[PDB]
Design a protein around this ligand. Structure first.
Ligand code: AMP
Ligand code: AMP
Ligand code: AMP
Ligand code: AMP
Ligand code: PLP
Ligand code: PLP
Lengths: 832, 832
């Protein structure tokens, strides 16, 4: 029945909304009632909600121009936004008035929200982080700017055909985007290739090709405080001139068709999660965000109340007190040599003076320690495409290694290990060394990840500069991740403690005084039950299904990777299958195991792991002896809007990374706040979460970081595990015999040789502890009342994992900025 | 001071307009007064004017769906619209209220109209015709549809650098288009390549690639009668599937970058005027309009009150009484085999029965007799790209030549001359033969052009089917071409005869009773003078100039071609130059000779002719002895909105085509209605115009069609002319000596060898008569009063050259449709 505090259904504003809705169907959409579709209705609603945003967005921006804050620019190559409609109504408190208004126009608003396409401009974690951050910078009142690429194809749509992933182009822009404001008026040029001449006073980047960067702005509304900040996303556009001009007389028409070569820089998002691919088109995407963003930054500093102020030079020795740029991973590292290039080559500051300014402005977030994720660009590729930025990266290495030398006299290996230039047969630039060297702050995303950085990959850097290294554990936004996807839970919590918790999540602690309160136990388990019934039917309707809603909904949803160990969960699922087929009239707690997530194309192992899951589902789900008891499902095309549907309905969250690989995790937190219990290793933010709810209100198993290290020193031999555990040996035999692949028996023999001979993530070493820890999960699900009271101990202790906490600490400890909860005055106009 | 009847500046609607204008700056544009530019103001105005259009457009279309007219589809690959803002206000009578409203918002509306980009979706004549037709079908109340390609780059922008044309891409869509309504909702597929299998009952076009055709609609408002018709322009979009799907596993990312190959079909307009280029991309553009349009046509027949009606089959033996398709030139000829393909292959009608339906639906306009303009497609290219349409074109040739054979027994040369298949070493299909064979009507665009067709190129066709051949002389729209570009002239005429003439131009005859009326002579010469002063300053401001406004403004503006004979006008200009330098203190009527127009890139001669003109301007305009007396100017980037500025200010119209080459002409008519006097040959519609004003109120010279034919029989020898005329011989010597090219003396030696040795258009044969006829022009300009009274005899007799006359005859004699002047009721809605 919903009607939670989705705000007020004010009679006035409901008459105002129905009116404006009907106006956009007519004037904007040019459609009449006896020819408009649901999609037409979705669009009229989008444009009406978007109209209540703009006086606040115009006022917020006018406001920062006269009040001149220090501004925070968050540079990221991914912004994984998902849908905007419900969120904007949550934030603007329009949700009950517009469901009334559409109720009375006769429509079902929840039906129309499903017509919205996700903005899938990110891959997984790093980009959802960027998107959660944005909401929390807007809610904390900060003059903050998200800058990225407007990709026309975001992350691909995954189709499973014959158990295999088939990729499809994510054509999210086809029907339009009501939430962007193209600003061609504000287009800027980006230069590529060319050459350098060092003439008279200095270096000059000459005979470059030009690509134009065209801005498109989306409003980011804070939670109910009248602040609407901007995300500025750049599109690539060919110049009107050389494309034809100069002697490129190989066809006028061919010359016009070749504009595309240059518009290809923002055509598509590279589909890889935690993996570097040294592709020239990725380096152009990286350089293109940085060049157009830095011109926008320098232009707002110059012409923001310094526009007035002369008397000596444009003094950039105020630039760090007016500017902060956060580098989200090393994909924007070119911001360092680019700020040096404009400062030294264009503004003709002195190197030392421009460097000090660059360091005090810049800061870097590391997102993984895994080697193959790290960005090490071929220097042949850097000086063709950016010959001046390679000069500048050489000068910087030289001055930095002279700082190392002077502080660690004679330690010639330190010099070679700290170098930004990796001498090897294919000399490369290590971009994370660049970022550490040119940022005043470097941070990890969970305390364990941040300690691993200090003790192993950046230890040379940490003893040279202890002061750069920090931690800022990730967060999730309680607006999307609690009140937007779980209005039932938010209602029952608000009903007991109020609504002040959505901008102050630590308040969830007050729920601890209701673990022993019976009305609350019935309510917490009833929302969980409605959400499970609502997801059961989602799959029978939108994908034909019959899952059983009374089973434990066991879900692992995240990008498909070997470190994430979807395969361990796979090994758990066929044990349980085989225990059942051996003692079939033995009771067992029923479960639906749902596993979903995207594989990069060409990550062959990840593509085999999808095929293994669906192959376990083909057998398990069609065995008459198993019945209700076990159902294996692959959840196709996992994305942000599916995550808002499957994380509310889950009972068990599966976060089983090998310890020391998952830097933080954030699905982690989405499940803890929404009432699931976590099975997991002492990895990433899991460690912090078990610390917040009590180890005992969590299900930890497996090796700790020391134990993987103790096992690598020995040498990991999986033949030992196979040999010592019959249950495991049997799974391996089934796999290699063709039990799961009848017609093609040797299909999964790649995963078996991987597990048996070169498994980097030690699946078999965590298997016994995982099957045992999984017995304890089922034992407690059997006790409903007690499963629900540790769920309440998890929800009530989730406050630390709100992004408002993360961002209030980035603000204070790195940007040097202060958070506000205050409402911007922002009404608007009126005259007659 | 303007304020003509540009309608009423109603206080109410002026308050309504200022209000809505301010609304779009805020809600649509997201801009505030202290940050909006002129372009922002232009856009808010465009969106407010466009809002008064939509209830009429939605009502007009609802109206044709219940009233079910026969619909007229005008298939054209060019629609040369120009700007839409002023036109829509002219047609909707909003022009005085919006100039008041913007006056009071403080803006200058005439300033904001100049921010509008032309829709330059056409090359010259054929496409402006299509655009004039559209306005007149909407003004005559016809259920008519313009269908074309939405090109992203229309015809190039011409820059002259060093006297040479330099092409630039026409990026008209950059800042947006407020007048289109994308309708992705209504996307349809177009198939290419594949193969045919003839299975069981019939042929099947199998294994085709698919390109999606995406519709974009623009409103076409009739003059003040509440009718708003649609122009539907198709965009090419890649499928989401094979682009990646199938084994096109040569990169996921490369697969996404290759979507462009298919979106290239509507990237750019081929820049050639009256010239065929057998390029595969042109044939895909041609097939793409036809396939998506014909699906739209069949779908509105089926599902328009026949949607209700069953009881036997969908009977297409009602299709010609419900449908008319006009083929604008042979660029849509594929409509014939495509209607046969759907009817025979898809609806499984019998061939004879589907053919009769195709002929009675189809009709064809020929636009030129010049050979190199004619479209003769390589059959290797037709059966790769469209293997079924080549089967169908073979069957049709076979049945047609069996009709010829039966009626002209034994005439084996007729058979080979009438064939749609030109056997030659590169077998080709003659598309005009196809069009004659599959249309029930074929028409020329001027009576002489239409007689030339019957007597020479299609004479075999005419004696086989006399009944197909017709004439429909072209027209120009008096809305754009009189009241929109010349409000001064329209005011003074309306002031004496009223305003009913703008939808009934023949009324201009009433002005004949004011040739001997003095108030009218002062008024007709004063508007001409204001318009000349307003164009003088246009070039000094927008291009730095100082032309003299008291000189005779002598202008030839049209596409650069050898048949058009810009070179004869060039030969006139240096005679006059040399007469002056020989008798310098002899008075001569001063003139500014303006020549402008676009050359196709790679039409080398046309590109030399531009260079010759600017080279005559470099010498002539910098001779101290010449002074005020002669100024040669190249009018750069001639397009529709420049034509609205230079045709009002002209005194002399130059239409000097070699007789029998210009099929009709329409610049012709624009100048006659706007008060210029025509110098011209007895070519195209010039013949009809001299017939309407009296031969004597015109300046005819040169060979008539018989004389060119009499000279070709002899053989044309230009050495005879050179030999017999000293003035000519001298021009040739100057040209070949380097008089006009000091630093590179042999630069124009290509044009001299062309003139002297292989001039197809007989420049020198019309030279004596042209210099002599030009003496008579200057003699009358010396007599102001008498130049103005023959101008009044030209304006007063222009009525026949309105497109409402052309279209009322296409309607009656070919579409079988009746014209209405009645106002559609069309107000709109209201409720509380
Ligand atoms: N030159 C100016 N005069 C007055 N207001 C301005 C000016 N420049 C910016 N503003 C205001 O501040 C906003 C900041 O623009 P931007 O620098 O692009 O983020 C503008 O949209 C206006 O509200
Ligand atoms: N995320 C990944 N993890 C591990 N190996 C990968 C991953 N993505 C790709 N690969 C490997 O790296 C190559 C380049 O990446 P891609 O074309 O994206 O698969 C592939 O051909 C595989 O050999
Ligand atoms: N199925 C229908 N029911 C009612 N009105 C319709 C229907 N189909 C079309 N119309 C009306 O007629 C117009 C014609 O659409 P079209 O066939 O696309 O040119 C629509 O925009 C509606 O105004
Ligand atoms: N409109 C034209 N009239 C005459 N010759 C032309 C024209 N356009 C092109 N040509 C010739 O035809 C060839 C193909 O056309 P284009 O590439 O458009 O110039 C050119 O290379 C010239 O040889
Ligand atoms: C939050 C989120 C993630 C991150 O989940 P992890 O378990 O941290 O990998 C990935 N993808 C989607 C769609 C998400 O919403
Ligand atoms: C009307 C028009 C033409 C046609 O002029 P002609 O003299 O018939 O060639 C060509 N181009 C433009 C821009 C026009 O407006």
């Amino acid at each position: 029945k919903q009607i939670s505090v989705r705000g007020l259904a004010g009679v006035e504003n409901v008459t105002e909304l129905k009116k404006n809705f009907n106006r956009h169907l007519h004037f904007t959409l040019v459609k009449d009632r006896n020819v408009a579709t649901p999609r037409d209705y979705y669009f009229a609603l989008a444009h009406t909600v978007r109209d209540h945003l703009v006086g606040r967005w115009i006022r917020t921006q006018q406001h920062y121009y006269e009040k001149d804050p220090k501004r925070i620019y968050y540079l990221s190559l991914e912004f994984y936004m998902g849908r905007t409609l419900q969120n904007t109504m949550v934030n603007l408190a329009l949700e009950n008035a517009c469901d009334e208004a559409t109720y009375q126009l006769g429509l079902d608003m929840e039906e129309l929200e499903e017509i919205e396409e996700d903005a899938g401009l990110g891959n997984g974690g790093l980009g959802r982080l960027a998107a959660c951050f944005l909401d929390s910078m807007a809610t904390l009142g900060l003059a903050a700017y998200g800058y990225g690429i407007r990709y026309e194809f975001g992350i691909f749509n995954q189709k499973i055909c014959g158990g295999w992933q088939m990729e499809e182009a994510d054509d999210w822009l086809r029907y339009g985007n009501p939430w962007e404001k193209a600003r061609p008026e504000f287009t800027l040029p980006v230069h590529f290739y060319g050459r350098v001449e060092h003439t008279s006073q200095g270096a000059k980047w000459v005979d470059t090709q030009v690509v134009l960067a065209m801005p498109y702005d989306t409003p980011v509304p804070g939670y109910r405080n009248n602040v609407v900040n901007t995300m500025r996303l750049w599109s690539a556009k060919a110049p009107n001139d050389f494309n034809l001009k100069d002697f490129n007389v190989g066809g006028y028409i061919q010359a016009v068709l070749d504009r595309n070569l240059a518009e290809n820089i923002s055509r598509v998002l590279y589909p890889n999660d935690n993996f570097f691919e040294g592709k020239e088109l990725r380096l152009k995407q990286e350089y293109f965000v940085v060049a157009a963003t830095l011109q926008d930054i320098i232009r707002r500093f110059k012409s923001s109340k310094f526009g007035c102020r002369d008397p000596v030079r444009t003094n950039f020795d105020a630039f760090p007190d007016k500017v902060a740029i956060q580098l989200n991973d090393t994909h924007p590292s070119l911001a360092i040599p680019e700020l040096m290039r404009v400062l030294v080559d264009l503004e003709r500051l002195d190197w030392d003076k421009a460097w000090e300014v660059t360091v005090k402005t810049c800061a870097y977030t590391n997102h993984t320690v895994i080697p193959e994720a790290l960005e090490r660009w071929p220097v042949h590729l850097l000086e063709t495409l950016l010959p001046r930025h390679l000069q500048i990266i050489y000068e910087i290495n030289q001055r930095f290694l002279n700082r190392v030398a002077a502080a660690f006299p004679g330690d010639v290996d330190r010099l070679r290990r700290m170098s930004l230039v990796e001498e090897g047969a294919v000399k490369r630039i290590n971009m994370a060394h660049l970022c550490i060297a040119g940022s005043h702050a470097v941070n990890g995303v969970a305390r364990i990840h941040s300690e691993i950085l200090k003790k192993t990959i950046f230890k040379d850097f940490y003893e040279l500069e202890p002061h750069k290294f920090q931690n800022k554990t990730n967060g999730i936004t309680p607006r999307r991740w609690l009140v937007l996807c779980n209005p039932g839970l938010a209602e029952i919590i608000a009903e007991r403690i109020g609504e002040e918790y959505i901008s102050d999540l630590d308040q969830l602690r007050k729920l601890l005084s209701y673990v022993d309160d019976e009305a609350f136990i019935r309510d917490v388990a009833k929302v969980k039950q409605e959400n499970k019934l609502k997801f059961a039917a989602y799959l029978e309707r939108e994908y034909k299904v019959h899952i059983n809603p009374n089973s434990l909904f066991d879900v692992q949803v995240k990008r498909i990777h070997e470190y994430k160990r979807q395969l361990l969960n796979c090994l758990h699922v066929i044990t349980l299958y085989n225990r059942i087929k051996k003692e079939p009239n033995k009771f067992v707690v029923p479960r639906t195991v749902m596993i979903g997530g995207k594989a990069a194309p060409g990550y062959h192992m990840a593509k085999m792991i999808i095929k293994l899951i669906t192959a376990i589902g083909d057998v398990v789900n069609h065995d008459p002896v198993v019945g209700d008891r076990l159902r294996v499902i692959f959840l196709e095309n996992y994305r942000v809007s599916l995550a808002e549907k499957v994380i509310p309905a889950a009972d068990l969250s599966e976060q089983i990374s090998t310890a020391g690989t998952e830097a933080s995790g954030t699905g982690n937190m989405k499940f803890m706040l929404n009432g699931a219990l976590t099975i997991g290793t002492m990895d990433g933010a899991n460690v912090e979460m078990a610390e917040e709810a009590g180890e005992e209100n969590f299900f930890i198993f497996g090796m700790r970081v020391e134990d993987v290290d103790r096992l690598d020193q020995r040498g990991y031999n999986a033949q030992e595990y196979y040999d010592r555990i019959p249950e495991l040996r049997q799974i391996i035999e089934q796999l290699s015999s063709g039990f799961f692949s009848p017609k093609q028996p040797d299909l999964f023999k790649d995963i078996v040789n991987m597990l048996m001979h070169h498994d980097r993530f030690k699946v078999f070493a965590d298997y016994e502890e995982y099957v045992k820890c999984q017995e304890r999960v089922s034992a407690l699900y059997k006790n409903p009342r007690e499963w629900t009271r540790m769920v309440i101990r998890n929800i009530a202790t989730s406050g630390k994992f709100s992004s408002d906490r993360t961002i209030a600490q980035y603000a204070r400890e790195i940007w040097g900025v202060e958070p506000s909860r205050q409402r911007l005055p922002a009404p608007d106009e009126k005259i007659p």
